[PDB]
Each structure stands twice: as C-alpha cells, then as structure tokens.
Design a protein around this ligand. Structure first.
Ligand SMILES: CC1=CC(=O)CC(C)(C)[C@@]1(O)/C=C/C(C)=C\C(=O)O
Length: 154
C-alpha cells in the first residue's frame, strides 16, 4: 500500500547557514536541481502555504503543487506534502530535519529527510521507492554543495 524511507547527508557547514536555505519553502530551486521555477502567493512561509513548482524540461513531470505542513525554525524541521501535478507520486509527504554535529573539531550539519508515498497498483515497493531515494539523495548532495560553497565565501 505505502512505502517509505529516510535519506541522510553530512554537510560541512554550520547549521544556521544550512537552515537559512532549507527553510525557504518558496525558493527550493536554490538547491533542488530539478526545479526551474517556484511560485507562492499569500503568506509565503507559513503552515498552509502553497507552491506551484515548475520542473526543468526533459523530466517525466512538468508541474507540482506542494503544501507547507511543518515549519519549525527553533527545531529545524520543514515538512511538506505533494498534492497535485504531472508526476506519478500520490500522497507523498516528506520531512527534512537538521541536527548539529561536530566531526573533526569541525562544526557541521546533518540533514535527515524522510518521506512516505503511495505505490501505484502497477509498480512495486522497490520500483516506486528507489526512484524517490535517488532523487532525494540528488537533492541532498546539491544542498551540501550549495551550502559548502556559501561557507567558503563568508
Ligand atoms: C523532481 C521530481 C520529479 C518527479 O517525477 C516528481 C516530482 C515532480 C514531485 C519531483 O519534484 C520529485 C521531488 C521529490 C521526490 C522530493 C522533493 O522534491 O523534495
């Protein structure tokens, strides 16, 4: 019926720097490398906000409509739920959380992202769910790059 997983990333960057971009429900293309454009009306960063995401050409999907479910600026948790679009993900929801970790007298961030999604009557737990891991891992990878790049500038 459903299928779920958690992806993890060690980032060589301070938490607030990482959170300052993860917390922009309105500008996910800062780091999500498959998004081309994001539009959000009303109160931009507030539980209930809605983004219309445009995806770069040559993707299986072209459009996605997502809703901000959790935003914890004090605990560093952003939770979202995908509600419409071209893709085959149904009842997708994910939560990305951030945690302080010092590895080598080097202060950094640990990003943890869990999702739950429905699996089409057609496909399998593996088929549908591996696709999303790979995607999220791509996103987290890019979050580490973008994040570590800014660090090197400041
Ligand atoms: C890149 C892309 C391709 C799809 O086929 C589904 C969808 C359009 C939702 C997606 O944005 C998937 C986004 C995912 C899985 C996590 C996220 O975005 O944080």
């Amino acid at each position: 019926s459903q299928c779920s997983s958690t992806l993890v990333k060690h980032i060589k960057a301070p938490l607030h720097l990482v959170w300052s971009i993860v917390r922009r429900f309105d500008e996910p293309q800062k780091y999500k490398p498959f998004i081309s454009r994001c539009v959000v009306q009303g109160k931009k960063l507030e539980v209930g906000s809605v983004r219309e995401v445009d995806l770069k050409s040559g993707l299986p999907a072209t459009k996605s409509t997502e809703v901000l479910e959790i935003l914890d600026d004090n605990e560093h948790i952003l939770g979202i739920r995908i509600v419409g679009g071209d893709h085959r993900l149904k009842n997708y929801s994910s939560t990305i959380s951030l945690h302080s970790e010092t590895i080598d007298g080097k202060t950094g961030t640990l990003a943890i992202e869990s999702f739950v999604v429905d699996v089409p009557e057609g496909n399998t737990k593996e088929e549908t769910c591996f696709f999303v891991e790979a995607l999220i891992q791509c996103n987290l990878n890019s979050l580490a790059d973008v994040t570590e790049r800014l660090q090197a500038e400041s």
